[PDB]
Design a protein around this ligand. Structure first.
Ligand SMILES: Nc1ccc2cn[nH]c2c1
Length: 164
């Protein structure tokens, strides 16, 4: 079946817990595979040690820039950027996992977890999974955001990997 992966997240050096994500490889296999491999670190790089750098309350929590840690960087397992696979899955509510980008066909490693329905991103960002477990952790992360996206705590993915 679809991969299950995890992110263990600290805030200011203390653990918040685990976010478990289902990756919809059935619908977006290339996008799911990128995220899966970045969680395991098996290509020699990935999310371990990187941050949630942009968090906006009542919107989303964004992470995955493991090169620049500021939202300008990141890279995929295929190359620096890769195409929008499809827009079949929609931003239907809290818990949606979707690719951050800088316009059409600029997927790398940055991603976000929605804390509300973000329907205006449909057809613009590739949704590729959702939160199976740990929405409590996501709500904690969300609470350390601001309107500008600047976080009020240092939010770090201390560990990550694949469960199945
Ligand atoms: N892949 C990717 C995702 C978000 C942003 C923002 N600037 N550059 C990016 C590149």
């Amino acid at each position: 079946g679809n991969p299950l992966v995890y992110l263990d997240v600290d805030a200011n050096g203390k653990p918040l817990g685990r976010v478990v994500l289902e990756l919809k490889a059935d619908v977006v296999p290339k996008t799911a595979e990128n995220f899966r491999a970045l969680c395991t670190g098996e290509k020699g790089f990935g999310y371990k040690g990187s941050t949630f750098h942009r968090v906006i309350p009542s919107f989303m929590c964004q992470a995955g820039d493991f090169t620049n840690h500021n939202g300008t960087g990141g890279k995929s397992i295929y190359g620096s950027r890769f195409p929008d696979e499809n827009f079949t899955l929609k931003h239907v509510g809290p818990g949606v996992l979707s690719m951050a980008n800088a316009g059409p066909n600029t997927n790398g490693s940055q991603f976000f977890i929605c804390t509300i329905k973000t329907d205006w991103l449909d057809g613009k960002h590739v949704v590729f999974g959702h939160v199976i477990e740990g929405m409590d952790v996501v709500k904690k992360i969300e609470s350390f955001g601001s309107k500008s996206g600047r976080t009020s705590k240092k939010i770090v993915i201390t560990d990550c990997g694949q469960l199945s």
